[PDB]
């Protein structure tokens, strides 16, 4: 078997956004360079609304 | 020690966040310890169930 669990099922995904979301769901099953945790932000702005 | 190691092995086998012992108190036969999830994910009933199961498939039900 190429993979213990497939990265995603191609028939299920419909657009590029679906591919990205599926990769984020199954990313724990792979050997990851950086194990995800809570993220850190250094810049943030809020524009005026209507 | 053996219980924590076994839970870590099970958490590796089936993908689940791991545990890490912060502090403990152990008087007589009564013990209380605080365990921290390594990745910071919130505690889940699956995690508690797996930790409670102790020596699974090694001892009797």
UniProtKB/TrEMBL annotation, chain A:
It comes from the Viruses. Signal peptide: none annotated. This is Vp2. It comes from Banna virus (BAV).
UniProtKB/TrEMBL annotation, chain B:
Belongs to the reoviridae RNA-directed RNA polymerase family. This is RNA-directed RNA polymerase. It comes from Banna virus (BAV). The chain holds residues 733 to 793 of 1219 of the full protein.
